[PDB]
Design a binder for these strands. Structure first.
Ligand code: MG
Ligand code: MG
Ligand code: MG
Ligand code: MG
Ligand code: MG
Ligand code: MG
Ligand code: MG
Ligand code: MG
Ligand code: MG
Ligand code: MG
Ligand code: MG
Ligand code: MG
Ligand code: MG
Ligand code: MG
Ligand code: MG
Ligand code: MG
Ligand code: MG
Ligand code: MG
Ligand code: MG
Ligand code: MG
Ligand code: MG
Ligand code: MG
Ligand code: MG
Ligand code: MG
Ligand code: MG
Ligand code: MG
Ligand code: MG
Ligand code: MG
Ligand code: MG
Ligand code: MG
Ligand code: MG
Ligand code: MG
Ligand code: MG
Ligand code: MG
Lengths: 17, 63, 47, 10, 47
RNA sequence: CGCGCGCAACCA
RNA sequence: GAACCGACUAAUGUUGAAAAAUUAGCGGAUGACUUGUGGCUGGGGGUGAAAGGCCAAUCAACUAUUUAGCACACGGCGGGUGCUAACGUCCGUCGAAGAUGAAGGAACUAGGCAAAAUGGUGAUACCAGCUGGCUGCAACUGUUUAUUAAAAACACAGCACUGUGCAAACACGAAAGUGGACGUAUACGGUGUGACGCCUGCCCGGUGCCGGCGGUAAACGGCCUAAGGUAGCGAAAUUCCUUGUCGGGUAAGUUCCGACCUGCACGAAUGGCGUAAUGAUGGCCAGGCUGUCUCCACCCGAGACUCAGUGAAAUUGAACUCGCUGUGAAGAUGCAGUGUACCCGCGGCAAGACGGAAAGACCCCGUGAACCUUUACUAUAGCUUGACUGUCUGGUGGGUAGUUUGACUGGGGCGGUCUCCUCCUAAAGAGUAACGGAGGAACGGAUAAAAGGUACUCCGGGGAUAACAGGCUGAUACCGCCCAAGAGUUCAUAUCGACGGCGGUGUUUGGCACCUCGAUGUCGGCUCAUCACAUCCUGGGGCUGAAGUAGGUCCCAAGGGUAUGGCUGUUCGCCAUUUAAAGUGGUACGCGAGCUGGGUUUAGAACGUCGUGAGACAGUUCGGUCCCUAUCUGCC
């Protein structure tokens, strides 16, 4: 699981790979 | 497509309407060296999106 | 006592074009905070 | 997007 | 024909919103029904 | 890639 | 073209000679001129050829909490989130690398800014048009933001709609009354448009308005629907993509001109398209001219400098006021380590003293403030309706007023959320957070009753909280290296090298919010640089898929060197022509108490667009004040 690039810290957990 | 075949150049967006955009290297360009063809994108304000967009554009051009 | 343009062959700033009170001056002499000093043996006016 | 903010207590 | 007596006539839309009901806008805006400078409907409205 | 192909995508 | 009136450019001046001037130029100069004296108009008021202009240097007059300003911080261990990143955030618990050690003649520049030149009559001094070509916009002369905006903005003649029958409509007036107008529909008011020429298409469903369900768009508007954009025009003041494509122009042209039409998002009186003349109007090209520049040199005066007289000012915790590297509330004269340095002037320069000048204007915050806004709410003047000018009464009523417009939020906005239930997070009692992971059924209720805009803004605060730079971090980025499937005729490793792996750098885009909101000025250009080496050239090597020539690649090497132009504000890039090469980076993306101000980032204005509107737009377009006499360090 990774957060998308240039995205701030909050607003839920990222997406899986 | 092979990623080494082309290169990616980043630079500053024209018409820099503020202290942030004055500095940031959000504007992008891909040169596909053997074909010689060029594409660029400064539509977005994040560099990452821009790069992707211009890559797509490049691909389209190649096609 | 020679100025930078005579002594060190410094390029004069624009003789016109808005340039104010700054025609034959040495321009900048250093950087910013980092060195925070003028380096020794800087090319300046005198003799 | 976040759609998980809910929780009860006991 | 300013000799005749009549001074210049500033259009409401040219004015600021504080001056005339038509006044105000960035560029040329007029999303108002045409009224006198005292807010009375100008086209059609009888007396 | 947000919200409904459309809209939004901002302030320095 | 003088006086006079103005105020487009310029340099100076910016503790001035001046609380907006100076010299040089510049516009109008028989008029919509200018001026003297006196009078009138008064503050939500005037006045305004309209800029929110001007009205005496003054002018938009744990829990609960509409609650988050009981902010915690780090280290350990158990976690969530993040990248098993962060001096991050939210809970529980006590191999091998880095940055201080004359001739030329626009080649200038954003731009020929400034100069130079032209100059008279039919010219020796002073005096005294630069000219021409293409084009946008506005017809024109005028007016405008006194003091950063003179314009494409306003006005304008003209055109149209509409009201108005005279005790006129309308306006100022609690009223009388006055203006309109001593006028009377060929007149007057309001609204839009804006000379002139050719014109001005369709839609009445919506919101108005008019008539009594109809009508009306030169009403506000729009072009399966109310109708689907007509003529004209079209990458345009509008075209994002885009520096569109082609042509012209040029050695080279992001600009310009002509076409094309793919009109993101032209379009017909919030006029469309032409348009002679006019413009301190915008863009482009040419001739002339020139120190604009190549690249400055000399001279003449005024300061600067020395003496004599007088004699300020901002600033200032105290100073016995060095460099570096580190450290540190995270960029050090003061701390550690270290190097260097006799004491003291003067003339200079301006890199630092997050220098001085303004309790930041940007951002957020405040149950601040103002104005403006509208179909936000509540009123209300006025207008209108009736019942008995008055009282009551319905309607209408941003004309005017008082207000309103939530919080959470890895700054705010936008999106999402707000109450209750179940699970996990939760670390074997209970509890236990996050815009954590999964699911289900403004919820301690500010009022009975409430949207917005502000770049015209304002105040109080905040580095509690953003944009710049620093810091931590290194996902991304860049630079290596490992493995070797293959490509390379054959042959992995001359050159490449997939699928994967491991680093380094701080170097892009980021994350964080630690530094500063009692101001740390922002891109680019210029002037000055300085350091790194991951070296572009020159130097020395190895290997070569190295005959030579010429290369490719790798190692060593930072001593020196490392382009002028066209286009664009640009960095970048493209092109032209060079060059031995036209290095890549750090240095507050070096350098504004050194310069510029073209871009951006106020107030004017316009277009496209969105909004009913005020206004707004990481859309565009024209215009738009850059202060500081140096105490200390530093340096000459
Ligand atoms: Mg400086
Ligand atoms: Mg106006
Ligand atoms: Mg009003
Ligand atoms: Mg205004
Ligand atoms: Mg005044
Ligand atoms: Mg509290
Ligand atoms: Mg707390
Ligand atoms: Mg912390
Ligand atoms: Mg040049
Ligand atoms: Mg240019
Ligand atoms: Mg000139
Ligand atoms: Mg002259
Ligand atoms: Mg044009
Ligand atoms: Mg004036
Ligand atoms: Mg002014
Ligand atoms: Mg002016
Ligand atoms: Mg019409
Ligand atoms: Mg054209
Ligand atoms: Mg119309
Ligand atoms: Mg004129
Ligand atoms: Mg000469
Ligand atoms: Mg703090
Ligand atoms: Mg130091
Ligand atoms: Mg230090
Ligand atoms: Mg200061
Ligand atoms: Mg403050
Ligand atoms: Mg809030
Ligand atoms: Mg438990
Ligand atoms: Mg902070
Ligand atoms: Mg914190
Ligand atoms: Mg700066
Ligand atoms: Mg080396
Ligand atoms: Mg500017
Ligand atoms: Mg404006």
């Amino acid at each position: 699981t990774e957060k998308p690039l240039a995205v701030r810290m909050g607003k839920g957990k990222g997406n899986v790979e | 497509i092979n990623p080494a075949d082309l290169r990616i150049d980043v630079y500053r967006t024209s018409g820099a309407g503020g202290q942030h955009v004055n500095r940031t290297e959000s504007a992008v360009r891909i040169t596909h060296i053997p074909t010689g063809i060029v594409t660029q994108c400064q539509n977005d304000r994040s560099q990452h999106k821009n790069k992707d967009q211009a890559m797509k554009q490049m691909k389209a051009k190649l096609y | 006592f020679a100025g930078t343009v005579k002594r060190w062959n410094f390029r004069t700033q624009d003789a016109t074009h808005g340039n104010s009170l700054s025609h034959r001056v040495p321009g900048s002499i250093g950087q910013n905070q980092t060195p925070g000093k003028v380096f020794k043996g800087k090319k300046m006016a005198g003799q | 997007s976040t759609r998980n903010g809910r929780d009860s207590e006991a | 024909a300013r000799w005749r007596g009549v001074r210049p006539t500033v259009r409401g839309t040219a004015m600021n919103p504080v001056d005339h009901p038509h006044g105000g806008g960035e560029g040329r805006n007029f999303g108002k029904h045409p009224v006198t400078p005292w807010g009375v409907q100008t086209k059609g409205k009888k007396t």
